[PDB]
DNA sequence: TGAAGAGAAACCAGAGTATACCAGTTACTTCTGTAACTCAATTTTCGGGTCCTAGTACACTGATGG
């Protein structure tokens, strides 16, 4: 919605990089899940025609654009004259952009999404008229879902690297086939591996 | 009065002789690099598409059988 703050769209973009759980759970897979990456790395920024609207709303937020502006303040790199902003003092109605031109939305460190303002139109009477739901999803992609590599009946909850049982190197397992292949009777890892929790992108996105 | 050689008119291979190639080398040039601006021609390379054939997921259908 025009005249609707930025960070009203940043908080709406469903990306699975917000739901990834950190750390490795090989020794014991019953650990209290570390906070999803939505909570740990709260920083993000839009880039709209030479101005990094940074999400400095929270204290855990740090300037992701500082890296780029420093990297460009060095040796000339094509780019030049980068700006900054705060993304809570801005609405889409205050923004000076091109249509159909790719801009940036970086979040979770370097999960980059290419933003394209396809068109701008005055609101009609036959579309949604609310605001409580308006940065709303017109279309999404319906990605594929990874499955457990042992039995192809359930989706992958775990991804293991350097597994001394897996044929493939990154091997995805459901919970059942993971518990059954790597753990003797009480949680002592059998063999060697690095198991991480796997958020299926084709499910939470 | 034959004998042991004397003379005579044929072939026959071979040793110089005659060619017959077949290399063996002296000058005498161009062609490098660097520099520069010019302009057009040509190549390279380089990130990304592009089309195509072949599976793949996934919700639904359509029986099927116990
Ligand atoms: Zn993302
Ligand atoms: Zn499984």
UniProtKB/Swiss-Prot annotation:
Cellular compartments annotated: Nucleus
Oligomer and partners: Part of the SNAPc complex composed of 5 subunits: SNAPC1, SNAPC2, SNAPC3, SNAPC4 and SNAPC5. SNAPC3 interacts with SNAPC1.
Family: Belongs to the SNAPC3/SRD2 family.
Function: Part of the SNAPc complex required for the transcription of both RNA polymerase II and III small-nuclear RNA genes. Binds to the proximal sequence element (PSE), a non-TATA-box basal promoter element common to these 2 types of genes. Recruits TBP and BRF2 to the U6 snRNA TATA box.
This protein's name: snRNA-activating protein complex subunit 3
Protein species of origin: Homo sapiens (Human)
Name of the gene this protein is made from: SNAPC3
Portion held of the full protein: 207 to 411 of 411
């Amino acid at each position: 919605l025009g005249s609707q703050k930025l960070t009203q769209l940043r908080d709406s973009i469903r990306c699975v990089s917000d739901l990834q759980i950190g750390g490795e759970f090989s020794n014991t897979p019953d650990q209290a899940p570390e906070h999803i990456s939505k909570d740990l790395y709260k920083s993000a920024f839009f880039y709209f025609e030479g101005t990094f609207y940074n999400d400095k709303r929270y204290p855990e937020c740090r300037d992701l654009s500082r890296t780029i502006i420093e990297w460009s303040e060095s040796h000339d790199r094509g780019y030049g004259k980068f700006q900054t902003a705060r993304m809570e003092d801005f609405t889409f109605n205050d923004l000076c952009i091109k249509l159909g031109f790719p801009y940036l939305y970086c979040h979770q460190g370097d999960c980059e999404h290419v933003i394209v303002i396809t068109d701008i139109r005055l609101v009609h009477h036959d579309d949604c008229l609310d605001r409580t739901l308006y940065p709303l999803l017109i279309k999404k992609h319906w990605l594929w879902t990874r499955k457990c590599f042992v039995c192809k009946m359930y989706t992958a909850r775990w991804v293991t690297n350097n597994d001394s049982f897996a044929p493939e190197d990154p091997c995805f397992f459901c919970d059942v086939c993971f518990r059954m292949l790597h753990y003797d009777s009480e949680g002592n890892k059998l063999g060697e591996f690095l198991a991480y929790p796997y958020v299926d992108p084709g499910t939470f996105n």
